[PDB]
Design a protein around this ligand. Structure first.
Ligand SMILES: NC(=O)C1=CN([C@@H]2O[C@H](COP(=O)(O)OP(=O)(O)OC[C@H]3O[C@@H](n4cnc5c(N)ncnc54)[C@H](OP(=O)(O)O)[C@@H]3O)[C@@H](O)[C@H]2O)C=CC1
Ligand SMILES: *P(=O)(O)OCC(C)(C)[C@@H](O)C(=O)NCCC(=O)NCCSC(C)=O
Length: 1383
């Protein structure tokens, strides 16, 4: 000698550790079939039998939450099976994780006879007609389902996935999941579907084979079958009937990718159009002038009002006015600058810092204790100068990265040593680290700050503090000699009395081949002086041959150059920010002792491989002064990426580059040839990469693209409303609409059967219904809508009012998205606006009355004089129902929230009296309605309320009475009724009718048309919201705080009645779309990236694909996907040829033009031979070069002639990060990739479309099928998210790579529970740094969805003792979050 507390041991060697091998987007969930084996093992205990000798049949199994497993942890769950009836729970405390009805039995329970099949039907088939375990679980991985070797049961399957071979290893949770995978494998797609309701599961172990013999290694495989007629996935002694799932937002396993623009930047004196030029916008120029005037007059007032003579450096102050007037009221100065500050015209500098401290240094009363007193006030607002547009113009992320990386390319060590002497006055770590150094992956860095004392602001940075006087040479610690590769001198070499002595000592600290970074004032030297004399104590700087220091510290920019040049310093970069400070990157000259060796690389046929190979072999045998110079005087040449890869195996101490771009070379092309003039200048600087482009020497650098630029809005003619993140109403934006191509996305599958006639109408007003709010806020997934909308771009908006193609005014309902600026409305759904309604009023009529007629006349069959009960009389559907019922001469009973709604309805309908209204707050209407109707009941009920109001409404139904239920938020039991066909689902019927537009719709169309003519259909009261307030409008609909219709105003109605709509553009976010009438060539599109991106193009509009591969279809994965595209309605064609000759190119474009005009050319072909450079012969060096040189050039040629030039829209050439960072062994691949990018850059020069993605590592599909160069591989769904941005952008080459960290690895100190949960809860929301976000912003404002709310609530229980409700996690901030744990 409740009913079962079951514990799952997730330990190192526990038998249930395999449950960790079942994840979904990194998170580890408890399988949906684990609640069946838990109820089946609890009924067996209840019946006193072994669980493997009991035959059960679970029905209507539901899953309400998801247990979140955890490595090395114990999770408990309580099952409870009701003895007689058979109702079971899997409760996990007070929260339900699953439910259903388990009912054991003895007779036969299995419906399908698969339990008798013995052998496998997938025998003797070719390998191209079969899917193996590698290919089956590549498809699941793409959708987020990550299964380990334990859950990888399906060992083989057919192309249609009907027949499979399932491994039987004796683990039932694993086995059942491998049978549920059959249902998953039968619904190809790209979204992540989470099972929620298994209608009928039948497990019969009596017919199942026995447990495998102990120690077995060759587990037997049972045949499996999928039955689409009945939706039964049967295998062995298991049968899972109809299952249902819900789309779930895919979560990013890693941190967001780092997008960059691989662009050329000049070294010295960049022009305003160059990327290394200081970002001095006209507004900043005005501020610089504005601050100059305020400083100057404040300088003069200082002189006059200093009657106490308590102003130090007064002689220096006087000199400032002398220079200020030479290089040229106080209240007006404040007025002008204050106007600049207080203005909010969009053109607004990030902050106005220099003025504020100048004001603080001028507004201070001139009394005793001035010098020391004011020193403290400004030292308190020192940050204002540091973060100030005027100063942060030579420290913009572009320039800082250029300095740090260009130094890194030339430093021939593994650790980059930096030294910022004088980090207390002018800090550079706060800019160098977050903007340039944190992105380093191939090279390590070691920052070291130094000043007189402790640098307080450097406490939080990964720098090393050092104590030594910076402004006193001859005492600099001798241990600093040859200690740094880079020496930063931000506002330091101006405060040393003898700068001639200053750098002489500094030049000894730099390593041989090191650099000096110098940032000093060089212009408008009277602007920053008011706040310099009063800080600096010994303002006694001595002059020199270059002149006399301005005031006593500064040297003019042209005189800084003279000093360094005189002392033997080569200017590497001299970016002369023209407003104030100027930059100087200097390196000591290199004097070679052996003649450098130049080798021409121009040839694209690699006729130079042998010469380069021999010299490269002689590198590590010569002087330290021997250098190999690979040169090239052509735009098309892969020297820049080729050298990067050679350095990865030979070191950067002997390899140099020179490339001259002929197209952009200036009037005087550099004549680099052995003993030349220009060449000798390069040898002295000794820069690893020298590129002559746009007329100046420079280098290629990856400039970061801010996260805000990915959502930058640009004008677009056709736009539509969608959500950036599902389930968020605050994420609604306007995207580019596919209607710019003429057609509408989603013409695949069912939508291809109904060939409706459509009219292209220009939307003027769009009405918002409660159907849109229910979809936007995540209350209902987009899968509940008719299946014709599955592939549509959006699902928001149905009704509208605008002008058809002829200029006539119209209104009507169309399949979504009608919340756009152009719609293709079927001609059978278009009414005409009578010439008395404004288009604003017509936007309120169509759906409200179409639903009202459907409910009353079409579904309830209302008759004259019948009684009707309408819920929510104040709603737009409710107001329409009252109007229609009144026209039918009925007795109306309505529910109103408050008295204001009653007042509105009585005024709107004078017929209604107070007797016809009730209260929606409590269920007292049932008594009143039954009494007032004398017990006969109501003939029709239009029901929207739920719970006890729904039951009460049904009980008022007459003997014939009809119940029309149009509520959206149905209960789980009600939803199962819809699935079971027990009840009809009428809440998405207007949507269903509009897709078909059959006899049932035409009845409503005629009804509403007659209603308009007879005066019953009248416009409703409305509130108009501008397009940009779309988010605000949606919230107002959801709140239901006031009665009325909400219509978004797209355009302005013209005074005429038949007039063309003017062409105008709307701000919108990018959304790439492909013309369905054009043919897209995907060269090498049968690979891993090509097949999964071709799917992406199909969803976005493409319907004519030509996939070319060297061999054609050769595997079961390729044959299955091609079959999927063709079934959808795509006109695919696989060509088994290689485009390496003109004839092959002609063939490809003969087939392409046969399908239709060419509208896209992609090249994802790749053959890679990895080996050591010195062990490559020519035949092996040009292996990758065929697909990346011999292919792109031929494709480029055909994309320049007619008719391809005019019709072509996209020209994508996939590249690799090897061109930007280099890699070991793939020297040939680097040469091929670099030439490919130089071809793409040429196209951009001629104005042709071009896009060159540069990926680092792609996870789900590709050659990876983990951490390379400290770079994580991207999930493919994220690749296509940034790929979309790449196409809709102006740059040519974009770099996308995911960084493991910026040092997190081996770095942490969390301890208190009050912080342990924060990182967990912060991680759940996808916030890498919890403290970064606001401590008062509600979680729903961040976009807290469900599953993400479930995890937070479950995480609190698992991590602490808190038990909260999901209703609070969406209104429960970070500050209140931290309070609960402590309590
Ligand atoms: N880790 C990654 O996945 C990365 C990918 N990239 C780029 O992505 C692109 C594709 O990646 P992936 O798809 O994984 O490469 P795969 O090797 O996965 O597939 C490459 C495809 O190229 C096709 N191909 C090769 N040569 C030719 C040719 N001469 N004519 C026609 N087709 C050809 C092959 O078809 P067959 O097999 O029939 O010859 C093969 O299916 C490549 O260009 C690569 O540079 C960039 C960075 C990293
Ligand atoms: P919101 O949309 O309210 O979230 C509802 C959720 C939590 C998703 C719930 O309805 C649900 O279905 N939870 C997940 C069920 C589950 O256990 N799935 C995992 C096993 S199946 C597998 C392939 O993931």
């Amino acid at each position: 000698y409740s009913d079962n507390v079951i514990d799952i041991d997730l330990s190192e060697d526990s038998p249930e550790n395999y449950l960790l091998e079942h994840a979904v987007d990194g998170r580890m969930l408890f399988p949906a079939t684990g609640t069946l084996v838990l109820a089946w093992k609890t009924l067996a205990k209840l019946k006193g039998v072994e669980f493997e000798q009991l035959g059960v049949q679970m029905t209507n199994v539901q899953i309400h939450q998801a247990l979140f497993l955890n490595p090395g942890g114990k999770t408990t769950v309580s099952v409870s099976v009701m003895p007689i009836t058979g109702e079971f729970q899997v409760r996990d405390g007070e929260s339900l994780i699953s439910s259903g009805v388990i009912t054991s039995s003895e007779g036969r329970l299995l419906e399908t006879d698969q339990h008798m099949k013995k052998g496998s039907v997938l025998d003797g088939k070719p390998d191209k007609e079969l899917l193996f375990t590698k290919e089956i679980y590549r498809e699941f991985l793409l959708r987020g389902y990550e299964y380990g070797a334990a859950f990888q049961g399906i060992q083989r399957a057919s192309l249609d996935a009907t027949d499979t071979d399932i491994r039987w290893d004796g683990r039932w949770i694993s086995y059942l999941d491998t049978v549920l995978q059959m249902y998953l494998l039968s619904k190809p797609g790209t979204h992540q579907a989470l099972p929620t309701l298994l209608e009928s599961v039948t497990i019969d172990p009596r017919v199942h084979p026995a447990q495998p013999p102990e120690g077995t290694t060759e587990f037997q495989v049972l045949p499996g079958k999928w039955d689409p007629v009945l939706q039964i996935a049967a295998a062995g002694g298991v049968e899972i009937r109809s299952c249902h799932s819900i789309r779930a937002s895919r979560r990013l396993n890693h941190d967001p990718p780092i997008l960059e623009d691989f662009a050329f930047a000049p070294y010295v004196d960049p022009r305003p159009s160059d990327r290394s030029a200081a970002a001095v916008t006209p507004a900043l120029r005005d501020y610089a002038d504005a601050c100059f005037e305020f400083s100057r007059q404040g300088m003069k007032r200082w002189l006059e009002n200093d009657k106490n003579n308590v102003l130090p450096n007064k002689e220096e102050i006087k000199e400032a006015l002398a220079m200020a007037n030479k290089h040229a009221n106080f209240a007006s100065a404040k007025a002008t600058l204050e106007a600049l500050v207080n203005n909010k015209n969009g053109h607004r500098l990030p902050n106005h810092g220099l003025f504020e401290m100048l004001d603080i240094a001028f507004s201070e009363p001139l009394e005793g204790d001035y010098w020391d007193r004011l020193r403290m006030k400004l030292h308190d607002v020192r940050t204002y100068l540091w973060d100030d547009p005027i100063i942060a113009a030579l420290e913009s992320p572009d320039i800082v990265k250029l300095v740090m990386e260009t130094v890194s390319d030339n430093v021939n060590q593994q650790v980059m040593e930096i030294l910022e002497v004088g980090a207390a006055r002018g800090p550079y770590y706060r800019q160098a680290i977050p903007k340039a150094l944190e992105y380093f992956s191939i090279k390590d860095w070691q920052y070291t700050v130094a000043d007189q004392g402790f640098v307080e602001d450097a406490a939080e940075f990964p720098v090393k503090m050092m104590q030594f006087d910076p402004l006193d040479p001859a005492n600099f610690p001798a241990e600093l000699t040859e200690s740094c590769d880079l020496l930063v001198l931000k506002w330091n070499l101006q405060m040393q009395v003898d700068l001639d002595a200053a750098i002489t000592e500094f030049s000894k600290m730099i390593k041989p081949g090191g650099f000096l970074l110098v940032l000093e004032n060089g212009t408008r030297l009277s602007t920053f002086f008011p706040i310099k004399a009063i800080v600096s104590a010994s303002l006694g700087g001595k002059g020199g041959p270059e002149g006399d220091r301005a005031m006593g510290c500064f040297y003019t920019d042209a005189q800084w150059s003279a000093l360094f040049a005189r002392h033997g310093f080569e200017q590497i970069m001299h970016i002369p920010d023209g407003i104030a400070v100027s930059m100087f990157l200097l390196r000591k000259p290199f004097e070679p002792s052996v003649a450098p060796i130049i080798i021409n690389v121009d040839d694209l046929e690699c006729s130079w491989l042998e010469e380069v190979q021999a010299r490269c072999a002689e590198l590590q045998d010569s002087h330290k002064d021997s250098r190999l110079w690979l040169v090239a005087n052509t735009e098309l040449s892969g020297v820049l990426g080729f050298l990067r890869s050679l350095v990865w195996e030979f070191g950067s101490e002997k390899l140099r580059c020179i490339q001259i771009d002929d197209a952009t070379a200036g009037p005087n092309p550099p004549k680099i040839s052995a003993d030349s003039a220009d060449f000798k200048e390069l040898v002295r600087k000794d820069l690893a990469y020298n590129v002559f482009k746009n007329g100046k020497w420079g280098t290629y650098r990856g400039f970061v693209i801010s996260d805000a630029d990915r959502q930058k809005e640009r004008p677009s003619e056709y736009v539509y409303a969608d959500w950036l993140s599902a389930g968020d109403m605050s994420s609604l934006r306007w995207f580019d609409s596919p209607l710019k191509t003429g057609h509408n996305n989603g013409m695949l599958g069912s939508k291809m059967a109904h060939k409706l006639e459509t009219e292209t109408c220009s939307v003027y007003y769009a009405g918002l219904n409660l159907r849109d709010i229910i979809l936007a806020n995540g209350t209902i997934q987009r899968d509940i809508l008719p299946e014709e909308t599955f592939f549509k771009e959006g699902v928001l908006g149905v009704e509208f009012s605008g002008r058809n193609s002829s200029g006539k005014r119209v209104m009507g309902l169309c399949p979504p998205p009608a919340l756009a600026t152009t719609v293709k409305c079927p001609v059978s759904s278009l009414w005409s606006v009578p010439d008395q309604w404004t288009l604003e009023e017509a936007a309120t009529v169509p759906l409200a009355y179409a639903t009202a007629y459907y409910c009353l006349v079409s579904e309830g069959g209302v008759q004259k004089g019948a009684t009707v009960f309408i819920h929510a009389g104040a709603s737009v559907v409710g107001q329409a129902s009252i109007a229609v019922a009144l026209s039918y001469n009925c007795e109306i009973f309505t529910l109103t929230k408050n008295s204001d709604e009653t007042a509105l309805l009585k005024s709107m309908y004078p017929q209604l009296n107070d007797r016809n209204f009730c209260s929606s707050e409590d269920c007292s209407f049932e008594k009143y309605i039954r009494k007032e109707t004398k017990g006969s009941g109501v003939d029709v009920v239009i029901n929207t309320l739920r719970g006890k109001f729904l039951k009460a409404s049904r009980r008022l139904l007459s003997k014939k009475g009809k119940f029309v239920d149009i509520g959206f938020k149905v209960d789980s039991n009600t939803q199962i009724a819809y699935y079971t066909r027990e009840h009809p689902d009428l809440r998405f019927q207007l949507d269903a009718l509009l897709e078909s537009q059959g006899p049932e719709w035409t009845r409503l169309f005629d009804l509403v048309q007659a209603g308009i003519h007879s005066g019953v259909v009248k416009p409703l009261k409305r509130a108009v919201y501008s397009m940009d307030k779309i988010v605000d409008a949606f919230k107002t609909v959801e709140a239901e705080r006031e009665a009325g219709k909400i219509v978004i105003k797209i355009r302005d109605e013209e005074r005429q009645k038949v007039c063309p709509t003017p062409r105008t553009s709307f701000p919108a976010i990018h959304r790439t779309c492909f013309h369905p009438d054009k043919s897209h060539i995907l060269v090498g599109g049968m690979g891993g990236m090509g097949l999964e991106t071709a799917h992406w193009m199909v969803l976005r509009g493409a319907k004519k694909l030509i996939l070319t591969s060297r061999y054609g279809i050769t595997t079961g994965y390729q044959a299955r996907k091609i079959a999927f595209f063709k079934q959808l309605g795509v006109e695919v064609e696989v060509l088994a040829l290689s485009v390496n000759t003109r004839k092959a190119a002609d063939k490809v474009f003969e087939h392409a033009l046969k399908m239709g005009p060419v509208g896209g050319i992609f090249n994802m072909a790749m053959v890679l031979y990895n080996d050591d450079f010195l062990k490559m012969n020519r035949e092996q060096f040009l292996k990758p070069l065929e697909s990346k040189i011999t292919m792109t050039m031929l494709l480029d040629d055909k994309s320049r002639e007619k008719p391809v030039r005019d019709t072509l829209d996209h020209f994508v050439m996939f590249s690799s990060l090897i061109v930007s960072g280099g890699h070991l062994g793939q020297a040939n691949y680097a040469f091929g990739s670099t030439v490919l990018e130089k071809i793409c850059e040429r196209r951009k020069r001629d104005g042709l479309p071009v896009t060159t993605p540069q990926w680092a590592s792609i996870a789900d599909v590709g050659t990876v099928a983990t951490i390379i160069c400290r770079k994580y591989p991207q999930r493919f769904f994220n690749v296509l998210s940034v790929f979309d941005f790449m196409m809709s952008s102006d740059n040519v080459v974009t770099i996308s790579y995911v960084l493991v960290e910026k040092s997190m690895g081996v770095a942490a100190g969390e301890e208190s529970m009050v912080d342990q949960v924060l990182r967990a809860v912060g991680k759940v929301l996808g916030i890498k740094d919890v403290s970064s976000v606001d401590g008062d912003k509600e979680f729903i404002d961040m976009g807290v969805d469900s599953l993400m709310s479930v995890e937070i609530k479950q995480a609190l229980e698992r991590d602490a003792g808190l038990v909260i409700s999901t209703k609070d996690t969406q209104l429960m901030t970070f500050n209140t979050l931290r309070s609960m744990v402590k309590g």
